[PDB]
């Protein structure tokens, strides 16, 4: 196939000007889509705060106006999903992945409104859910929307504009341009066959998306953790150990989300009214725990700078880790709309800080900072559970800007993904697609 290759080589990277321009417009909208979405989640979280002030005397009435407010917004978001778009539940990265395998539809006329307003209810109630899910699915659909509207033809355009949608989606969610592109490249594309996703174009959409976000967000970063200490060569072995610890935890955590989907499905059976009521109680438990014990609730981005700085005790870290494991399962496995990425950063940090603590006390000759162990453990639940480690690394590299820690971050991450493989575990997004594609047939 030599004369064919010589021909193909000379024709490499000639993306059609039409997809390059349409990549620009998809990114722009997904940036605005995300920006609007973030600002809207923030405004609800504020309103919820301003309510606990008007009622700050009567602590029982306080705990009551805190539970109901998060339940009402949660139910509103559960209902918006079952009634009008049932595949905008949970994260939604499984669906956009399916859409690229051409096994699942992109119902953009339904989910764009369902995910945005439904997410605003669940995220803005302070449930344990990420902006990733929503902005990545919203942005995938926005990519379809413009494919239809301009009726571009070809596989290239469908797969590309679908892809640069999800990419611009994840970049604008974490101010993470590289992490978006690397999410498509390592995790989102169809994994068992060739594809025509133009990468030059996924880049143009990511650029545009991230500029939109910078237009409404500058001067403040999502995670400010400062510049930590370096890691000396004789320390590396301790990071490879930490990864091993994650690689056995990753797959255990996968099992729990899947079974909790089942365990919570038994609660409503399928019934659009039991289900919504359940997420009212779930969201309401979150709105309560957000007043009485904040670090056990919310997206988790708030407690990461605190945990890195060693400002929690080892006893608090154990508490938070158990509780947050619980409320991540209650909130993500229920199917409420919203991602799992962001709370897997939290879980990974808290566990990483605690291991840093013990390593400090066992080895003073090493001159450790426990913060460097949290920063290696931020991308480690990503790597051990959803098995996209090169994305967690470049995500965590981008959000915390401690390049000097690249080696122990890589090293922890391969340890987590190698022990996840070898202890018999499955990439979380793919084992959700499979159970979804395996019922979209078992009905026959």
């Amino acid at each position: 196939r030599r004369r064919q290759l010589i021909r193909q080589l000379l024709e490499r990277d000639k993306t059609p000007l039409a997809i390059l321009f349409m990549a620009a417009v998809v990114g722009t909208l997904v940036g605005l889509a995300a920006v609007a979405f973030d600002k809207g989640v923030a405004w609800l979280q504020n309103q919820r705060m301003g309510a606990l002030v008007h009622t700050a005397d009567n602590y029982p009435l306080l705990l009551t106006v805190a539970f109901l407010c998060s339940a009402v917004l949660a139910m509103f978001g559960y209902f918006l999903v079952r009634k009008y778009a049932p595949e905008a539940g949970g994260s939604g990265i499984p669906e956009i992945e399916g859409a690229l395998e051409d096994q699942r539809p992109v119902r953009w006329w339904r989910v764009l409104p369902v995910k945005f307003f439904g997410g605003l209810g669940t995220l803005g109630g302070g449930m344990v859910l990420g902006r990733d899910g929503p902005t990545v699915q919203i942005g995938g659909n926005i990519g379809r929307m413009v494919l239809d509207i301009f009726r571009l033809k070809g596989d290239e355009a469908r797969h590309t504009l679908l892809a640069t949608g999800a990419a611009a989606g994840l970049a604008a969610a974490f101010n993470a341009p590289l992490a978006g592109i690397l999410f498509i490249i390592e995790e989102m594309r169809p994994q068992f066959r060739y594809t025509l996703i133009s990468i030059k174009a996924v880049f143009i959409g990511v650029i545009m998306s991230t500029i939109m976000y910078r237009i409404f967000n500058h001067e403040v970063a999502l995670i400010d953790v400062g510049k930590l200490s370096d890691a000396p060569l004789n320390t590396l072995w301790l990071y490879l150990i930490l990864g091993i610890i994650f690689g056995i935890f990753g797959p255990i955590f996968n099992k729990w989300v899947l079974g909790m989907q089942d365990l919570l499905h038994r609660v409503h059976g399928g019934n659009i009214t039991k289900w919504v009521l359940m997420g009212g109680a779930i969201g309401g438990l979150c709105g309560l725990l957000g007043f009485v014990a904040p670090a056990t609730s919310g997206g988790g981005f708030n407690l990461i700078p605190i945990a890195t700085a060693g400002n929690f005790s080892m006893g608090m870290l154990v508490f938070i880790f158990v509780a947050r494991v619980i409320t991540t399962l209650l909130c993500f496995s229920s199917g409420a709309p919203g991602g799992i990425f962001a709370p897997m950063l939290a879980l990974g940090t808290v566990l990483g800080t605690a291991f840093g603590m013990v390593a400090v006390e066992l080895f003073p000759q090493y001159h450790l900072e426990a913060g460097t162990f949290a920063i290696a453990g931020m991308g480690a639940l990503l790597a051990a559970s959803i098995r996209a480690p090169l994305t967690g690394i470049i995500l965590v590299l981008e959000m915390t800007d401690n390049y000097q820690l690249i080696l122990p971050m890589i090293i922890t991450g391969l340890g987590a993904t190698l022990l996840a493989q070898f202890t018999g575990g499955k990439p979380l997004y793919s084992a959700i697609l499979a159970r979804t594609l395996a019922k979209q047939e078992a009905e026959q």
Partner: antibody
Amino acid sequence: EVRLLESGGGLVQPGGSLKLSCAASGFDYSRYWMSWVRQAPGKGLKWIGEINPVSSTINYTPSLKDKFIISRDNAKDTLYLQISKVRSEDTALYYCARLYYGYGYWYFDVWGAGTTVTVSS
Amino acid sequence: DIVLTQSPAIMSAAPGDKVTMTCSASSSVSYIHWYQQKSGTSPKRWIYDTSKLTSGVPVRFSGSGSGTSYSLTINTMEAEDAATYYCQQWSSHPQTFGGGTKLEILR
């Protein structure tokens, strides 16, 4: 140049106290751990303690509750050592040292000139 | 804690002649360092991580060893090589220096 200039050491009475002081010039004094080493007359180099740049971990040699108090003033580019209940054991040349590492086994990167503490009635 | 005993507590050797002191540890020890103290001057870091010469340290100097025994060495001693050489360890905690080895000219 990189210069460590410690001062404060003189004549003190047994059971008294003194506060030594090391003045760092010519490098980013933050980001480094700092340490104190003392050398009793015609004897070996002995380690007192160390302090980490955010003052969050401070270790001292197996010796006594409030004997030593290491602290640092990152804003003033200066490192401090307080010795209490001073015995004649503590008559020594005191060194201020910056710490670094190679393969990760820490060494005493740059020492200063010293100051002498004389403890006598 | 880990006690370090340097071997020729004092010694002399002519210029252009081959000098060798020893550092010996009560337990097992990794990556020793060596400091050179002249009379009236701050100790200088001389060799680190068992073997590595600091920037400036003339190449005649050299370290070696493993586990519980190490050493310093001068292929061709010079005049300005006369000083005390302190070995030092931090493989274990806390760290410990050696008693000293005084090097004087012979004449």
